[PDB]
Design a protein that fits this description.
This is part of a larger assembly, with nine protein chains of nine kinds. Chain G is largely without helices or strands. Chain G is built from one helix and no strands. Chain G is 10% helix and 0% strand. Classes of the chains: A mainly alpha, B mainly alpha, C mainly alpha, D mainly alpha, E alpha/beta, F mainly alpha, G little secondary structure, H mainly alpha, I mainly alpha. The complex binds the ligand CCCCCCCCCCCCCC(=O)SCCNC(=O)CCNC(=O)[C@@H](O)C(C)(C)COP(=O)(O)O and iron/sulfur cluster (SF4). Chain B: Its main location: mitochondrion.
């Protein structure tokens, strides 16, 4: 039945991504005094189906003519890693329970950059290669803070096991303990997912389409699905890490509802941010991380090391 | 690799032979281009370009217009390359 | 010795041979350096885990710390070589002789 | 009369020679960059024809002005300001041949 | 001719052009494993005519009064053996030439597999038969020059036709160009 | 077949090493290194080294070679060299696989192969210990003792990393 | 004073090492990428071919 | 025939998908771009209809030639059209794009964009009101709805 | 075997989609469509590496907090963090952090 569980994790996540697209469109429209897609189906519920079918039936252009193996691997790697990163998350029981699921997710996120790295290069264009390079720098720059902030907050968890986060936050959300870290981590998620105001990679206003400028029809759809799946997964990781939920062992449905609602709130926050702010300049993006954030994260890491010792609140290892 | 005067003459004659508008038969070291060969001013400009390509040194316009004898080309090349 | 040790030692030997036989690019040779470091990490980790040398489980980590230092040094040299010659080609490192 | 760039016809001829040189050496680069299907010889022949079009001019100022225009066109071709369409406009490929004998003109239309 | 006695029935040879099905066919044969060549193309002399030449020939035939009731034949400027033409195609395309000749029985199973496809037998086998046939020489019928149009040589127009098939193989390695195909004339 | 997952993984590790050792364009070399790193993580996980193997997945794959790739991208070559691109690369690649196959077959057929060392063909599961670690991850405690026991290692490694930052700056100065 | 003692014929052609430094080649390390910003670009207002 | 029925339903599906998700490209030369933006503005918002502006020609399905097409701009317009994947539709907005409009007799104006690229729907106006442009887009959607690609394939 | 199963399933699913998106829509009939500067700012990438090394060195800290010599552990942890901060400050002050 384990394969059944794998499918139950995979297909609903893809459907959620498809409808997250519609949700984004409608929310952005309403914050711009507009109405989202509503002609295609009741209240626009059938729009993602139309979008997908239109994309698939569309011409498969491919002037890459260089390392087509890479030009095909990049979408595969992106989608596969986006689906895999969902596996260790405890909602409330994880599909795969790892002692170090957190470091596993960090490694998978680091790997997922290779999808953008290769796609842009195998495209063998101008915007594609330079845009891919800007991507590497962006994700790489925020990966540092992501790890430090994650280590700082888990110092209270006592392990890298995602499941124990529920136990640690049983009485209070960890945001109350580490809100500065929470803010920096949220911005870090935004940067890692390449979302506005850090949507420099794609960067349509500046780069025609970025790394996916030479990707069309299905491969572009897979990149879109990977992007949105990463958005939902990172927001779910935020919800588990900071906005903990009550878990009744006999009725997991309550925790599942609470967790889903919090992740939806965070994704809506992502769309809200995309609507509000303009895009940070490539240079300003790095200035905000290495020169502004990296320091405060180091100080807070020292503090979160020191606090359990000086407050005798060292969490149990098991 | 002594850069002989006769080798320069051979290269010059070979370049002139390659040029189609010059008929190979009446080509001579002393055959002045405009009269003997009948080629025009732009023709002379093209052949000087071919010469400067073959020997790798740029011939200025004032020196180029003083040419129009293959012997003049050879001796100018010798002067610029310091032969004898 | 089990066969896994044979395989990893073979991997190190292959990587060493690749490093000692350059073709054109320096980056390929630096790839062989990083690869040899991976072989050494895997071998050391297997030894330490099998022998339950608890206090040596950090040796693989320090090995990698210095592996990345060496890699970084290699790239820092490769960029300068490319700037001075336009390529990373080994044949351009020819000024010093004997 | 104030000279534009040359006080005499000879100096204008020197400038023409320079411009011709530059066009001549530029032609293969134009063929390679613009991915034109013409041969280098064909392009250079067109260059020669274009230069001979202005040969009848017997005024130094007119020659200098033509040289300026030639330099501007050469700068356009050296850069990628001109597109493949602009470069091929010299070769009137699409336009059908227009016969020049009297009898053909009489047949075709009322044009003189 | 029976229905329209004075109809001008033009008889063109192989036609090549930007959207050709003859040159492009050979260019895409590289995709199909190697380069299938019946008798290594040593028994198939070809005389391809340029598409623009054919079109202008048709137009001039329409304009010219004498064209009526005349079976015109459009022949290419030069005749090439199939091997020569395919070699030149692979040269201008800069694609690796993998010519393996086709023994009737040995490659008949390949042709049978092509036919076995539930869709068309890979553009039928008649196309392969056309490849397995040299161009007929019919000098009695009038040609392009009779209409006044002069056939353009393939070599000049091959670059345009097959640059689309030119890939990074020639883009990255500009190198130089290639030499004209061998003319069996 | 699940009895020799470690051996299958080690063979894949050797194959990736032949791949990046034959020196295709650093892109494919990077691919071979990435595959080898993942496979080494697999072997380490099988031997009980979850943390250590995961370290390679992040600080090696997404680390040292993540920049190796960023570097090759800056120094872009005209053509992506592959194994078949150069006859020697393809030939060495095949010979490397053949070399592995020869030793692998010899080890299995001859209970005791001796290339330079002596190797027994018995499965790796044999060497494992039957002890119990209790409520502990021995790898985790050993790695965490770096702060409690290996203070000297911490000092030297930190100093080396700082001097590495300074050194890289000085090397990239370029005057 | 030769580049190397007992110089072979091939080595004889080779010049001695420079007194201080090697003469750098002509560039061949970096240049100014030329970009057509528009006209289709969203920020180019549709009719601006900004050659940067 | 059953095969004809299946083909017809499939063609209905693909036509519905293509007309529901029409992605015009951000291509506006002259004044009519302003009215195009006003169509994108909240009052007549095109996103309700599935019409979304996407900059990439490779990611776009319809080209709206909103503005005077000059001789200098024409080759670029043709290039962007060619790089656009198929199925591709072209909507000509404004008298200037339709037939040259006010500048029909100008030396530097292409007298209509039909000369350079094929046109599917012509939107009259100078400028065409945003409602007229939305009407033209919906007419294009109906045109897609009437397409019978798979039917013609089955009839061969 | 569970983790291996998950990896296999995900990879196969993604590759299956890539197949149905690279070949399946490629059948649809159509026609012919024709069709770097040395980054010295890569120093940022290199600095990431040496900082990622400290990242790796710092990961054992949650288990390091479980020792009995908490004084030594805290001193060494703050030592590593202060050395990292010193490295960042050095690169900052020497204009080494010249991003873009
Ligand atoms: C693709 C190929 C494009 C070809 C474009 C080449 C050009 O732009 S042509 C512009 C050059 N115009 C001139 O040189 C004007 C020369 N005007 C004259 O009067 C001369 O002919 C002189 C002064 C009579 C001298 O004539 P000769 O060169 O001695 O006889
Ligand atoms: S039709 Fe009118 S509004 Fe449109 S571009 Fe022309 S002048 Fe401007």
């Amino acid at each position: 039945m384990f394969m059944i569980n794998i499918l139950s994790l995979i297909i609903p996540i893809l459907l959620a991504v498809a409808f997250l697209t519609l949700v984004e469109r409608k929310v952005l429209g309403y914050m711009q005094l507009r109405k989202g897609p509503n002609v295609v189906g009741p209240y626009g519920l059938l729009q993602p189906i139309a979008d997908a079918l239109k994309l698939f039936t569309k011409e498969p252009l491919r002037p890459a003519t260089s390392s087509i193996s890479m030009f095909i691997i990049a979408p595969i790697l992106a989608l596969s890693l986006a689906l895999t990163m969902w596996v260790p998350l405890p909602m409330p029981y994880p599909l795969i329970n790892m002692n170090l699921g957190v470091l596993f997710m960090l490694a998978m996120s680091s790997l997922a950059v290779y999808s953008i790295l290769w796609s842009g290069w195998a495209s063998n264009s101008k915007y594609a290669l330079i845009g891919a390079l800007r991507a590497v720098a962006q994700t790489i720059s925020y990966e540092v803070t992501l790890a430090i902030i994650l280590l700082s907050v888990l110092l209270m968890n006592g392990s890298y096991t995602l499941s124990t986060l529920i136990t640690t936050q049983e009485h209070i959300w960890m945001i109350f303990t580490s809100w500065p870290l929470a803010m920096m981590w949220f911005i870090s998620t935004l940067a890692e997912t390449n979302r506005a105001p850090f949507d420099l990679t794609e960067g349509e206003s500046e780069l025609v389409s970025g790394f996916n400028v030479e990707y069309a029809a299905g491969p572009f759809a897979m990149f879109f699905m990977a992007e949105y799946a990463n958005i939902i997964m990172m927001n779910a990781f935020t919800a588990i890490l900071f906005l903990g939920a009550s878990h009744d062992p006999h009725t997991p449905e309550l925790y599942t509802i609470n967790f889903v609602l919090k992740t939806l709130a965070l994704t809506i926050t992502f769309l809200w941010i995309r609507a509000s702010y303009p895009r940070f300049r490539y240079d300003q993006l790095m200035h905000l991380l290495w020169k502004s954030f990296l320091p405060l994260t180091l100080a807070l890491c020292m503090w979160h090391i020191s606090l359990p010792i000086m407050t005798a609140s060292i969490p149990p290892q098991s | 690799p002594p850069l002989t005067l006769e080798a320069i003459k051979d290269r010059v004659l070979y370049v002139l032979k390659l040029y189609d508008k010059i008929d190979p038969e009446k080509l001579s070291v002393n055959s002045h281009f405009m009269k003997d060969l009948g080629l025009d001013s732009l023709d002379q400009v093209e052949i000087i370009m071919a010469m400067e390509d073959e020997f790798g040194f740029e011939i200025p316009d004032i020196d180029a217009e003083k040419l129009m004898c293959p012997q003049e080309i050879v001796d100018y090349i010798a002067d610029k390359k310091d032969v004898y | 010795m089990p066969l896994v040790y044979m395989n990893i030692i073979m991997a190190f030997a292959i990587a060493l041979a690749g490093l000692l036989m350059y073709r054109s690019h320096l980056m390929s040779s630096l790839l062989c350096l990083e690869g040899m470091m991976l072989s050494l990490f895997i071998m050391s980790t297997l030894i330490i885990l099998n022998t339950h040398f608890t206090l040596a489980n950090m040796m693989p980590i320090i090995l990698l710390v210095f592996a990345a230092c060496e890699a970084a040094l290699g790239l820092s040299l490769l960029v300068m070589v490319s700037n001075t010659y336009g390529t990373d080609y080994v044949q351009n490192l020819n000024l010093l002789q004997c | 009369v104030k000279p534009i760039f040359s006080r005499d016809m000879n100096e204008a001829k020197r400038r023409v020679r320079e411009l011709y040189r530059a066009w001549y050496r530029e032609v293969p680069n134009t063929v390679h960059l613009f991915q034109l299907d013409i041969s280098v010889k064909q392009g250079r022949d067109k260059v020669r024809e274009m230069f001979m079009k202005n040969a009848h001019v017997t005024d130094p100022r007119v020659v200098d002005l033509l040289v300026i225009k030639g330099k501007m066109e050469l700068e356009e071709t050296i850069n990628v300001w001109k597109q493949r369409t602009h470069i091929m406009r010299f070769f009137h490929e699409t336009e059908a041949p227009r016969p020049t004998d009297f009898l053909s003109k009489f047949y075709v239309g009322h044009d003189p | 001719r029976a229905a329209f006695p004075e109809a001008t029935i033009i008889k063109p040879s192989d036609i090549f052009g930007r959207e050709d099905r003859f040159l492009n066919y050979f260019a895409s044969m590289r995709w199909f494993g190697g380069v299938p060549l019946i008798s290594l193309g040593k028994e198939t002399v070809k005389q391809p005519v340029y598409i623009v030449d054919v079109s202008k020939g048709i137009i001039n035939a329409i304009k010219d009064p004498d064209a009526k009731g005349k079976t015109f034949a459009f022949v290419g400027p030069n005749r090439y053996l199939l091997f020569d033409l395919v070699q030149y195609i692979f040269a201008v395309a800069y694609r690796p030439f993998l010519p393996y000749p086709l023994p009737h029985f040995a490659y008949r199973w390949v042709g049978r597999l092509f036919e076995v496809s539930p869709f068309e037998p890979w553009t039928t086998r008649d196309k392969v038969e056309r490849v397995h046939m040299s161009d007929m020489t019919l000098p009695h019928l009038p040609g392009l020059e009779d209409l006044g149009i002069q056939a353009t040589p393939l070599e000049l127009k091959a670059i345009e036709v097959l640059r689309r098939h030119r890939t990074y193989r020639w883009l990255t390695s500009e190198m130089e160009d290639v030499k004209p195909a061998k003319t069996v004339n | 077949m699940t009895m020799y997952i470690a051996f299958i993984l080690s063979t894949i590790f050797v194959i990736g090493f032949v791949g990046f050792s034959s020196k295709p364009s650093p892109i494919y070399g990077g691919l071979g290194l990435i595959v080898s790193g993942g496979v080494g993580c697999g072997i380490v996980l099988n031997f009980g080294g979850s943390f250590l193997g995961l370290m390679v997945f992040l600080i090696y794959l997404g680390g040292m070679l993540v920049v190796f790739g960023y570097t090759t991208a800056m120094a872009t070559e005209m053509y992506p060299e592959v194994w078949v691109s150069n006859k020697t690369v393809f030939g060495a690649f095949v010979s490397g696989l053949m070399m592995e196959f020869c030793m692998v077959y010899y080890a299995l057929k001859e209970e005791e192969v001796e290339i330079i060392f002596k190797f027994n063909g018995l499965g790796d599961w044999v060497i494992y210990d039957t002890g119990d670690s209790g409520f502990f991850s021995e790898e985790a405690m050993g790695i965490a003792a770096l702060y409690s026991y290996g203070t000297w290692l911490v000092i030297v490694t930190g100093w080396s990393l700082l001097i590495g930052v300074v050194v890289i700056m000085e090397i990239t100065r370029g005057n | 004073g030769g580049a190397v003692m007992y110089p072979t014929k091939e080595t004889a052609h080779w010049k001695p090492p420079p007194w201080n430094d090697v003469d750098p080649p002509k560039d061949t390390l970096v240049s100014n990428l030329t970009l057509n910003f528009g006209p289709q670009h969203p920020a180019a207002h549709g009719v601006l071919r900004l050659v940067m | 025939s059953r095969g004809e029925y299946v083909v017809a339903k499939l063609d209905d599906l693909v036509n519905w998908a293509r007309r529901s998700s029409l992605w015009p490209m951000t291509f506006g030369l002259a004044c009519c771009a302003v009215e195009m933006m006003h169509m994108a503005a909240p009052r007549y918002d095109m996103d309700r209809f599935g019409v979304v502006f996407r900059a990439s020609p490779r990611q776009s399905d319809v080209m709206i030639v909103a503005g005077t097409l000059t001789n200098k701009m024409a080759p670029a317009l043709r290039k962007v059209y060619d790089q656009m994947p198929e199925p591709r539709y072209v909507v000509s907005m404004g008298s200037c794009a339709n037939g040259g409009g006010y500048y029909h007799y100008s030396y530097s104006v292409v007298r209509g964009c039909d000369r350079i690229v094929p046109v599917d729907i012509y939107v009259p106006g100078c400028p065409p009101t945003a409602e007229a442009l939305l009407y033209g887009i919906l007419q294009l959607q109906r045109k897609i709805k009437r397409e019978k690609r798979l039917r013609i394939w089955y009839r061969r | 075997m569970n983790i291996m199963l998950t990896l296999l399933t995900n990879v196969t699913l993604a590759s299956l989609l890539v197949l149905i998106a690279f070949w399946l829509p490629q059948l649809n009939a159509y026609s012919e469509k024709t069709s770097p500067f040395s980054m010295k700012f890569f120093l940022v990438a290199i600095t990431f590496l040496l900082f990622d090394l400290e990242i790796a060195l710092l990961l054992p800290l949650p288990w390091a907090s479980q020792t009995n010599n908490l004084k030594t552990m805290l001193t060494m942890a703050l030592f590593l963090l202060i050395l990292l901060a010193a490295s960042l400050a050095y690169e900052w002050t020497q204009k080494g952090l010249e991003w873009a």
